[PDB]
Motif scaffolding. Structure first.
Motif, short mmCIF file in Angstrom:
data_model
loop_
_atom_site.label_atom_id
_atom_site.label_comp_id
_atom_site.label_asym_id
_atom_site.label_seq_id
_atom_site.Cartn_x
_atom_site.Cartn_y
_atom_site.Cartn_z
N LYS A 1 -30.46 6.14 -15.30
CA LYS A 1 -29.43 5.22 -14.86
C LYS A 1 -29.66 4.83 -13.40
N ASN A 2 -29.14 3.65 -13.04
CA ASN A 2 -29.18 3.14 -11.67
C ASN A 2 -30.61 2.92 -11.18
N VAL B 1 -31.02 -2.58 -14.46
CA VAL B 1 -30.43 -1.27 -14.21
C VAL B 1 -29.41 -0.97 -15.29
N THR C 1 -25.97 1.51 -16.30
CA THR C 1 -24.90 2.28 -15.69
C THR C 1 -23.76 2.46 -16.69
#
Lengths: 33, 46
Positions: free
Chosen positions: B16-17, B32, B34
């Motif tokens: 994630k991110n 990305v 999230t």
């Protein structure tokens, strides 16, 4: 009856057969195309 | 004739991110990932 309601999916079958007719096993039912 | 038997398909970890390529059951993109809060339905995927 009136009113609006959607029909959510239930199941999908990856069968390769072909169909042209169908039958059915206070006893009434509506058929629409 | 629909395909009914196929070989096993692998899997890796989830990140994630970070802008990383992703393959979510044939969906390919680049962005990305999230945690979110939108609510889907039991049969909805994308």
């Amino acid at each position: 009856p009136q009113g609006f309601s959607a029909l959510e999916p239930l199941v999908d079958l990856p069968i390769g057969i072909n169909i042209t007719r169908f039958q059915t096993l206070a006893a009434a039912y509506y058929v629409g195309y | 004739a629909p395909a009914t038997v196929c070989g096993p398909k692998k899997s890796t970890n989830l990140v994630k991110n970070k802008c990383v390529n992703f393959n979510f059951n044939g969906l390919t993109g680049t962005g990305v990932l999230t945690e979110s809060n939108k609510k889907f339905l039991p049969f909805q995927q994308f």
